[PDB]
């Protein structure tokens with residue numbers, strides 16, 4: 001649907017189709033994302049229940065409705081400041097050896113003749129890394145794999161209520177079980193003025209917000225580098241940093257995000273009424289010809305590359321530096337292991353927001 005995106009960017013960058021508003025151009029998607037006053041992220045009733053949560057009036061509820069992702073400032077900033085430096089440059093420098101050793105370990109498990117790199121590399125890496133950072137027992141990776149499906153970007157589908165109930169029951173129980181054995185990261189959260197439900201929500205967000213997305217970055221990168229035959233060049237010219245950024249732009253793990261109008265507002269030539277949902281197409285903005293010359297092409301050394309794959313504004317992905325580091329080390333170590341790669345079989349996740357692969361079977365020549 002990238003051709004439909006281009007047509008919309010040209011004729012209706014801000015389009016109303018009866019029920020929701022949709023934005024396709026780079027200029028307007030960025031404007032929406034940055035104007036948090038007009039375009040709110042308070043879509044889960046968080047602000048409305050903050051008083052009763054902090055009072056202990058609400059005792060039970062789905063914890064994932066109360067995270068920094070579904071909040072506007074000042075609440076949003078009060079929450080985010082508790083972990084603003086979790087992925088600081090110094091912290092990541094120190095994690096480099098652990099991340100590199102971990103992917104080398106995962107690569108060691110790959111059978112060159114024919115293996116699934118999503119299963120052996122892309123899925124485990126982010127999970128193992130976040131577990132170390134949070135101080136949660138890696139010995140529960142498989143469970144973590146299951147719970148990663150709960151990431152907020154994923155919308156509902158019929159017949160999942162029982163399955164989801166099971167995961168929530170286990171996940172919540174696990175977090176409550178390890179709230180006081182985590183790193184300073186979780187300690188600061190557990191020792192704040194937040195209600196119990198919010199603490200749960202906060203820890204779950206940090207635990208699952210980047211698993212499927214980071215996995216998708218690695219998978220999408222492997223697919224793009226292979227299909228456009230760039231492995232040789234990337235190693236040769238050391239285009240890892242720029243190439244991964246071009247994968248993020250071209251094959252964004254998250255296709256779009258949503259906002260709700262906080263009052264009548266004019267975006268472009270349109271006046272969006274108060275209380276309307278606005279779908280922001282990150283994938284389309286990333287192809288905007290005005291901002292990305294030859295945007296329909298995968299240019300490995302494209303520079304600069306101001307894509308919106310991690311968002312923009314106050315909710316700009318907290319894990320961006322980590323995701324970038326993990327993916328880079330993954331792709332570097334992988335490239336150093338094979339002389340030729342061949343994609344034998346793939347299976348794509350069936351979702352309109354999360355963009356990635358469920359299976360990626362390849363054959364490698366070490």
Ligand code: HEM
Pocket residue numbers: 041068069070080130205206207208209210211213214217252253254257258309310311312314315316317318319320322323324
């Ligand atoms: C390549 C992988 C990733 C992609 C493409 C991705 C994408 C995003 C996007 C689009 C947003 C903004 C959502 C919005 O504006 O409504 C976001 C927010 C967030 N992401 Fe990521 N993410 C990735 C990896 C990670 C990782 C590794 C973590 C670490 C736990 C993480 C933690 C978060 C958090 C906590 C937020 C909310 C921040 C806030 O609301 O201020 N993400 N992510």
